[PDB]
Amino acid sequence: CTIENFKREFFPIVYLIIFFVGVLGNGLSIYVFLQPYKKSTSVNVFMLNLAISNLLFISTLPFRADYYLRGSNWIFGDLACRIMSYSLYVNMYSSIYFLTVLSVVRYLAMVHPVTSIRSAWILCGIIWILIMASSIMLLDSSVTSCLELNLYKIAKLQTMNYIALVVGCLLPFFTLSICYLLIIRVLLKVEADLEDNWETLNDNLKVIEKADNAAQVKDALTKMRAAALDDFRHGFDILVGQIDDALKLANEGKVKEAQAAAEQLKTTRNAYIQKYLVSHRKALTTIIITLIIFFLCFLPYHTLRTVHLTTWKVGLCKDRLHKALVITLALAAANACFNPLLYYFAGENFKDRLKSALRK
Ligand SMILES: O=C(O)CCCN1C[C@@H](C(=O)O)Oc2c(NC(=O)c3ccc(OCCCCc4cc(F)ccc4Cl)cc3)cccc21
Ligand SMILES: CC(C)CCC[C@@H](C)[C@H]1CC[C@H]2[C@@H]3CC=C4C[C@@H](O)CC[C@]4(C)[C@H]3CC[C@]12C
Ligand SMILES: CCCCCCCC/C=C\CCCCCCCC(=O)OC[C@H](O)CO
Ligand SMILES: CCCCCCCC/C=C\CCCCCCCC(=O)O
Ligand SMILES: CCCCCCCC/C=C\CCCCCCCC(=O)O
C-alpha cells in the first residue's frame, strides 16, 4: 500500500522534529518549574506533571523513528514494542486530563470561591494511576510489525476506542467547552463592573479637579470612598486609604493640596483593576490555547481513528483516509512539544522565571 511508503518518509521526519523541539521545551520548562518561586500556585504542579509526561513520551520517538527508517521493521523486543503503545496512550490521555484540570483550576482562580499544592499532587497522582491502570492491557504478557494495526488487535481496539473516545477525549472536551463558556461569562461581568468603578472614580476626580471650595471636594472624596468599598485586593485597598488622607486635608481647608492629592489617585485604582483582571485574562488565554490544542491535536485524530477502526479490512489499502489518520496521529504526538506554548504564554510569570533561571 502507498500509505506505507508515505509513513516511511513522513514519520521519521515529524517524530524526530517533535523529539528535538520537545526535549528542549520540556527540559527547559521542567527546569523552570523545579526552581523556587515564592508566589507559585497549584498551576505549577499540573504544568509540571504535563511536562514530565510529555518528556517521557518524547523519549520514545527516536525508537518509532527507527522503526520507519528500517522499512517498518521493529528490531527491539516485544516489551519495548508494548511500551511504545503504553507510553503513547498514557501520555495522550494524561495530557488531555491535566489540560482539562488546568483550565478548570484557572477558572476557579478567577472566581475563587483554592487548590493547594499537596492537593494538586494528589489529584495528579489519581489521574496518573487511573490512566496507567486503564492502559495496562497494552502491556500483555506481530512484534516485527510493532506499530501497525493488524487483524488480531482490531477487535480489542474497537472496544478500547469506544471508551477512550468517550471518557478520555469527548468528556474532557465537553468540560473545556463549559469552562470556556463560564470564563467568558465571568470576564465580561467583572470587566463591566471594573469599568463602572473606574468611571465613578473618574467622575468624582473630575468634580474635585474643578471644585469651588473645600466642602465640595470633601463631598466628592466621600463619594469616592463609597465607590472604593465594593485576588491581592490592592494591598488591602491602598487607594481607599490615600483617599482618607486627602479627606483629612479637605476637612482642614487645604483645597489646593487636596486636589493635588486626588489627581495622583487616578492611577492607584486601575492598579487594583488590573491586579484582578489579569487573572481573568490568564484564564481566557489558557482556555483559548487549550481549545486550539484539542481542535488541532486530538479531535481530528479521534474522529479519523474511529472511522479507520470501523471501516478496516485486511485486503484494502484505504489510502486517503489512512493518510489523514497518519497526519492527525502526528498532530496528536506533536502536542507533547506544543504544551510549553501554554507554559510560556499562560504560566505563572513564566517568562520572568525563565530569565531568572538562565541568568548566570
Ligand atoms: O500507523 C498507522 O498506520 C496508523 C495507526 C494504526 N494504529 C496503530 C494502533 C497501535 O496502537 O498500535 O492503534 C490504532 C488505533 N487505536 C485505537 O483506536 C485505540 C483506542 C483506545 C486505546 O486505549 C488505550 C488505553 C486507554 C485508557 C483510557 C484512558 C482514558 F483517559 C479514558 C479511558 C481509557 Cl479506556 C488505544 C488505541 C486505531 C486505529 C489505528 C491504529
Ligand atoms: C466550544 C464551543 C462549543 C463553545 C460554544 C459557543 C457558545 C454556545 C457559547 C460560547 C460563549 C457562551 C456565552 C457566554 C456568555 C453568556 C452570558 C450569560 O449570562 C448567558 C449565556 C451566554 C450568552 C453564553 C451562551 C453560550 C455561548 C455563546
Ligand atoms: C531514558 C528515559 C528518559 C526519561 C527522562 C526522565 C523524565 C524525568 C525528568 C525529570 C523528573 C523531574 C522530577 C520532578 C519531581 C517533582 C516533585 C518535586 O520535586 O516537587 C516539585 C515542586 O518543586 C514542588 O511541587
Ligand atoms: C515545530 C515542530 C512541529 C512538528 C509538527 C509535526 C506535525 C506535522 C503535521 C502536519 C504536517 C503536514 C504535512 C503533510 C505533507 C503531505 C505530503 C503528501 O501529501 O504527500
Ligand atoms: C534530571 C533528569 C535527567 C534526565 C534528562 C532529562 C532532561 C532534564 C530535565 C530536567 C532536569 C532538571 C534538573 C534538576 C533540577 C533540580 C531542581 C533544582 O534545581 O532545585
State how far the Cα of 306 lies from the Cα of 15, in Å rounded to an integer: 23
Q: CA Rg, the chain, in Å?
A: 28
Give the residue among 149, 163, 147 at the shortest CA–CA distance from 313. 149
Give distance in angstroms: CA of 136 to centre of ligand 3. Answer: 22
CA 71 to chain centre: 37
State how far the Cα of 46 lies from the Cα of 297, in Å rounded to an integer: 19
Give distance in angstroms: CA of 53 to centre of ligand 5. Answer: 14
Counting ligands in written order, the one closest to the CA of 30 is: 5
Determine contact, residues 277/190, Cβ cutoff 8 Å: yes
Q: Count of CB atoms within 10 A of residue 190's CB? A: 17
CB of 327 sitting under 6 A from ligand 1:
no
**Residue in this structure with the C-alpha cell 513522513, named with its chain if needed:** 10
Residue 11 in grid coordinates: 514519520
**Residue in this structure with the C-alpha cell 468611571, named with its chain if needed:** 199
CA 93, 182, 335 angle in degrees (round to 5)?
A: 25
Residue 34 in grid coordinates: 523545579
Ligand 4 pocket residues where CB is under 6 Å: 14, 17-18, 21, 327, 330-331, 334, 337
Give distance in angstroms: CA of 35 to centre of ligand 5. Answer: 10
Residue 299 in grid coordinates: 479531535
Counting ligands in written order, the one closest to the CA of 37 is: 3
Residue 3 in grid coordinates: 500509505
Cα torsion 300, 301, 306, 310: sign:
positive
- Give the residue, by CA position, lying nearest to ligand 2 atom 21: 185
**Crossing angle of helices 117-134 and 78-111, rounded to 10°:** 140
CB of 27 sitting under 6 A from ligand 5:
yes
Determine contact, residues 165/306, Cβ cutoff 8 Å: yes
Give distance in angstroms: CA of 50 to centre of ligand 1. Answer: 20
- One-letter amino acid for residue 153 of the chain: K
Counting ligands in written order, the one closest to the CA of 32 is: 5
Counting ligands in written order, the one closest to the CA of 182 is: 2
Question: Obtained via which technique?
Answer: X-ray
Counting ligands in written order, the one closest to the CA of 177 is: 2
Question: For the residues of 193-232, what is the DSSP string, one character each?
Answer: HHHHHHHHHHHHHHHHHT-SSHHHHHHHHHHHHHHH----
CB of 94 sitting under 6 A from ligand 1:
no
Which stretches does DSSP call E strand in the chain? none
**Residue in this structure with the C-alpha cell 483629612, named with its chain if needed:** 248
CA 20 to chain centre: 22
Cα separations in angstroms, 280 against 3, 47, 107, 184, 246: 46, 19, 8, 9, 32
State how far the Cα of 245 lies from the Cα of 240, in Å rounded to an integer: 9
Give distance in angstroms: CA of 97 to centre of ligand 1. Answer: 17
Phi, psi of 309 (to 5 degrees): -55, -45
Give distance in angstroms: CA of 257 to centre of ligand 5. Answer: 57
Question: For a pocket test of ligand 3, which of 24, 32, 34, 57 has the largest count of ligand atoms closer than 8 A to its C-beta?
Answer: 34
- One-letter amino acid for residue 41 of the chain: T
Give distance in angstroms: CA of 302 to centre of ligand 4. Answer: 18
Give distance in angstroms: CA of 45 to centre of ligand 5. Answer: 15
**Crossing angle of helices 350-358 and 2-34, rounded to 10°:** 80
**Atom in ligand 5 nearest the alpha carbon of residue 36:** 20
Give the residue among 112, 119, 99, 102 at the shortest CA–CA distance from 275. 112
Residue 210 in grid coordinates: 474643578
CB-side neighbour CA atoms (13 Å) of 354: 15
